[PDB]
Amino acid sequence: QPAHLCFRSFVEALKVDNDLVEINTPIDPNLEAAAITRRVCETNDKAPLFNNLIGMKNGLFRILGAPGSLRKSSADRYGRLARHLALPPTASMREILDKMLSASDMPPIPPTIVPTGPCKENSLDDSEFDLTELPVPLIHKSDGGKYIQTYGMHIVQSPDGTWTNWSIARAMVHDKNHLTGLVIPPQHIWQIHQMWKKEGRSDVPWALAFGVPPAAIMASSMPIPDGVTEAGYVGAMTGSSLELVKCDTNDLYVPATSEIVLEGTLSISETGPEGPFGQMHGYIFPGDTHLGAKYKVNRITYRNNAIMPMSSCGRLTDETHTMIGSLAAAEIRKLCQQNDLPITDAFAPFESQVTWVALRVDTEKLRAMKTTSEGFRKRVGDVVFNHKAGYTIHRLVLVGDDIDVYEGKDVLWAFSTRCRPGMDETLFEDVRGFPLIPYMGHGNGPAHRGGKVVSDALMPTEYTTGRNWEAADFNQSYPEDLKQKVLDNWTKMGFSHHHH
Amino acid sequence: QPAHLCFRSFVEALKVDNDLVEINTPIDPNLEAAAITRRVCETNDKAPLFNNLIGMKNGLFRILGAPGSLRKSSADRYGRLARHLALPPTASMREILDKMLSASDMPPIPPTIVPTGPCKENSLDDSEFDLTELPVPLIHKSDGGKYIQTYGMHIVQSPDGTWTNWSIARAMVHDKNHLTGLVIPPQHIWQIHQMWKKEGRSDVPWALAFGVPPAAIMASSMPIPDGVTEAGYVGAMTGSSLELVKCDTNDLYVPATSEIVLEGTLSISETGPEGPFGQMHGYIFPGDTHLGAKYKVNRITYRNNAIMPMSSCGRLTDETHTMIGSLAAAEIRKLCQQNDLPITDAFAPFESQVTWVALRVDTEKLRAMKTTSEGFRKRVGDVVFNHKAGYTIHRLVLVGDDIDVYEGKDVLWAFSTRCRPGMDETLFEDVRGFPLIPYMGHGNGPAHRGGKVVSDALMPTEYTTGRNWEAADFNQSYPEDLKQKVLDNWTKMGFSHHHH
């Protein structure tokens, strides 16, 4: 099967790419696997495949770390991500985000039900597993549990059957047959849970599938609109209907080639201790345990030689930056365009710990609006910060056409030189905040509200008559034929490859 | 003579270091020399020495570009700068800034007058030169003049004789015997000029020396206190009295080994067109000419085979970042300590285009103050933004002890994750602003006032009981013996030198 449609095939692709290291000697899931993965993420090294995991029994489980992290070269920086989507490994971020947005103006392609698949090769009933006996990793030394769920997809359906959501939310082992995890507004797993709690009759039928089709885990990490079933969006994006099998113990459907599937229920009444967890902004607050959602596991099914993907998340760069930030930015780009804002591109700079999004403005269009910074900032911030797609983002940076928002250096340059602190900014205190950012949930103000800003790095003439500067750089401050002379004589004079 | 005390010796040092490229074929001062230098600066390449400059006559002049710019390796990144100061080329920024601050608590060592020196090898009187006939560079394609003065030292003395200031301020050729340049508050050349204008009797006796002792050009770029004669500070810093010769046409004293010296007057009455100039924040506004100060040149003296240093300034990284930013930060560190603020380190991140300074706080000391963010931000900002040393800096970022302020990645991480926009910041509108920043002089508000902010990236417990997190990074989220195991097995498992 194609790599974008089958996780097992994606692992092969990474090998062929010379983007995998297979560790075949014993590795401890207590911290060692995650430490190796952390190091990989901080150095943009090859993804680790742990084929000999201390505590692996009867097929459960191998681990692949860093499945969506960066490669060291510039030329295929985003190659792992491209491999989730059938794109060339040299794809740019713009190309990846355009692929992720392409289904937004296409008819869904609903999934196809098949009678079986590899995810049914093995099964364990409710007398035959114990989640505390599996080789679940301790990912960070101070975590409050062993986080089984860092790169699987939760599957829940609205009570009326009309919306089936796929999303990544963290979860850890609570006891032999339960997990606890985050289920928080405005996330779709939380919106669906609230519909079941208002109905009041039963717990939420649930499945958690690990090692799903890569294109599916991408959509699972993207804030596509409310009410949109991710399976049909992925179908449209890939041009193919996804093959799903029914769960054995409920009527949800899981990808046929899922590596591991948990089936059970998400409680509408019970909670349990959850966290702390080393998280996307780079922090853990040891001892900061709070009540989270509680999941009951009734059944495990799995592939022979099952592989569990794992995100060892924290400081730059891992899946929580490459996927959460970039995919939110993509959705924000579209949302702004659909609100008639002249935005061409959006990206969450890694340097901001994906808490900022830079919005590239089509300044010819802006000029025709005959508006001002204050009015335009307010308009942009009202659209983004009042929408779910803006949830994780606390600073928007508006930049003109000369800035490549996918280059953090250039965003930082524009922000630092074109946005006057205070005057060129609008603060938003009466919007939903992202409590996971340290300065929110561990900060001086309300954990769930405010703390957001639009920073206008458009210069005044960009609103009126046009850009009135040139950069003092090699590109802009020298004529073309001089530039080319310099480059052609560079190594001849004595001074110092694109792939590497 | 030692490299730190003689520019000609500094050029040799750079050669021996394998940090020079000698271009011996003809190079045009109209843009070509500056384009090559710009490229060097943007790529951290070797400094260019242009030994065959089209228009060089009777010894005037060769050019050295990029004299204070960065080297490519991490291990000797700041080596050019270290070579200005007799420090090892592997010196850290902390070590360089400590050297620059060391004279602040030492008695001055006043200069020594000698009867002659190399700067007297050649002379041109007021019938024998023409500044428009010298090979003065056009540095950026849209500059409003040919900027002869980008790395020389202006010498002016208070009317009472008690303070002789050395400083870098830009100047360009106006006509055969005049320059125009910036002379703006609160700079010491401007403070001294105002004293001569209040006296009202004559123009300011002036000299401009190019290719001065490297330790002297460092102090010239540093905001040492009002009334302090840079020559005696450099003497104290280096442990040696600097040798100076008298000018021929006035009673000022210039370094004996200066490459080129202009003697004349700075007018107390006349101005002339100045600018625009491609500047330290990375911009030029073509056509933005304004009236600047006017200098009359009466005499040129120079060394045989004189070398003019040149800064091709603009986007990262050149002398306007490495010297202006870092040396302001150094002075700000000291100023805060002298005001009883618990600051250990200060640096202007390059990523901020040297418009920010990050202040590392001794949080044990902070805790003993029993204060709050609002009060501490206000106190820090009042000290810094009301002082000349804070002139160029528009954002202060307060960080705790875990942050290395000399690492821009870490500053950006702390700012983005620990400072809640608005709530954790104090804006300062009633302080002097730096008009050169685009968002000031070309922005929405007053060019000369306000636009400054203190951003507190200290977390709440840093004021009370102590840091209450660990980073989710390899260093902090794994025990020492695991970490060392991982590193020792790294290349064995399959994964990927300090000098490179």
Ligand SMILES: Cc1cc2c3c(c1C)C(C)(C)C[C@@H](O)N3c1c(nc(O)[nH]c1=O)N2C[C@H](O)[C@H](O)[C@H](O)COP(=O)(O)O
């Ligand atoms: C890629 C990725 C995404 C997420 C997470 C992780 C990864 C690797 C963890 C490592 C597990 C860490 C955790 O913080 N995490 C996570 C999470 N969203 C949550 O509500 N809860 C979480 O615990 N998202 C973000 C989301 O997946 C998206 O916000 C998505 O848009 C949700 O889908 P939907 O609600 O829009 O359908």
Ligand SMILES: Cc1cc2c3c(c1C)C(C)(C)C[C@@H](O)N3c1c(nc(O)[nH]c1=O)N2C[C@H](O)[C@H](O)[C@H](O)COP(=O)(O)O
């Ligand atoms: C290293 C360096 C410093 C400066 C400059 C340059 C370099 C390379 C130019 C390339 C020439 C560009 C120009 O913008 N420039 C410059 C300038 N200060 C000015 O008032 N005017 C200027 O035109 N400084 C900054 C200063 O030299 C300091 O602020 C110093 O502190 C002044 O000394 P003092 O007043 O404290 O004695």
Ligand SMILES: [K+]
């Ligand atoms: K989703």
Ligand SMILES: [K+]
């Ligand atoms: K602006």
Ligand SMILES: [K+]
């Ligand atoms: K000075």
Ligand SMILES: [K+]
């Ligand atoms: K703070």
Ligand SMILES: [Mn+2]
């Ligand atoms: Mn959804």
Ligand SMILES: [Mn+2]
């Ligand atoms: Mn001075």
